[PDB]
Design a protein around this ligand. Sequence first.
Ligand SMILES: [Cl-]
Ligand SMILES: [Zn+2]
Lengths: 76, 173
Amino acid sequence: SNKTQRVVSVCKMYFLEHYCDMFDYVISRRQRTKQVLEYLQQQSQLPNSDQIKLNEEWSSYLQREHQVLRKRRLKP
Amino acid sequence: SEGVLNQAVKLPRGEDENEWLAVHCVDFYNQINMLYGSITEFCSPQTCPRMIATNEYEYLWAFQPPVSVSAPKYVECLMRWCQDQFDDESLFPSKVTGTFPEGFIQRVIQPILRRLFRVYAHIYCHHFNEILELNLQTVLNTSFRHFCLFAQEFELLRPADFGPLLELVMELR
Ligand SMILES: [Cl-]
Ligand SMILES: [Zn+2]
């Protein structure tokens, strides 16, 4: 239709660039959290045993990852 | 063998549930606009003067008695109503300092997902043969199959909200 064919072509390549970036975040989020738990465990049973500082640095990471997820829907 | 791919719908460990729904609620709003936006001229007030899935289902719109409107006017009013929810920072806070209201899921997420699913119902029941001639059944099924898995993951839509596509959605889960 020369006017629909242009919108259908951009609609298909949108979901590609969208679902590719979607999986790009969901597997990078899981690989970033994996290294935070492994760092919380390898520092759990050194001295200090900071059951709060490890519980606080865990919250600090979750809040820091929380603001990342919020900006994914607030496109300028 | 095991279970699914876009099972990315699972909540990331240690994060807010209202945010994981709100971000996806905005995302499916964008995906549905891309699907209907490509067949925007195959769905006109002459083609579909009544917002309907199959002749048993009809969705009215209130501006307050709900009136019968055409399919493109119902979608145009639905999406303009969704943007009124997002721009309302008391519901969808854009500042990282703001928080969600009480019952953000039952009062905001579920009412929006109930309406947005109806565009899926109209495309399948009245424009699937036209979607089939556009190589969009792949994009349509993927966007719809992701919509149902996300709603099933958090129990957001009751079976009555899947009205006409309730039989079609049974070949999942
Ligand atoms: Cl996302
Ligand atoms: Zn239509």
